[PDB]
DNA sequence: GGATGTATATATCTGACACGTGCCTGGAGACTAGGGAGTAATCCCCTTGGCGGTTAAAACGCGGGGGACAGCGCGTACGTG
């Protein structure tokens, strides 16, 4: 609606954060919303390749 | 009849003890000041019991091969007179 679309972070408790996977992928599955954990590698290929 | 082993008595060594003496260092008495005990406040560090998540280090298993150890020879260096 107000067109900011820009970068936005959400700070979960890792317990819940598939709980909050689903919710984004049901809720507003256009968005692009992506999932920041793992180990060093993983976190580098979130960097590099997304 | 001559020579030999044992037994009590007296002089000498030898560390310990009684007495003497100096003197100086420790003790008795009085006074004082300050060092340390006690109190209160404030704030930071440590204790004991929990939780969650990462992850690198610890634990375990197994092959194998390098090294510890035993045995034997030798010759020389050290023991002995």
Same mark, same amino acid.
């Given at each position: /609606? !107000? !067109?900011?679309?820009?970068?936005?972070?959400?700070?979960?408790?890792?317990? @819940? #954060?598939?709980?909050?996977? $689903? @919710?984004? %992928?049901?809720? /507003?599955? $256009?968005?692009? =919303?992506? =999932?920041? #954990?793992?180990?060093?590698?993983? !976190? $580098?290929?979130? !960097? %590099?390749?997304?």
């Amino acid at each position: /609606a !107000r !067109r900011q679309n820009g970068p936005h972070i959400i700070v979960v408790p890792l317990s @819940t #954060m598939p709980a909050w996977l $689903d @919710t984004f %992928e049901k809720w /507003a599955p $256009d968005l692009n =919303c992506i =999932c920041y #954990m793992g180990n060093q590698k993983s !976190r $580098d290929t979130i !960097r %590099e390749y997304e």
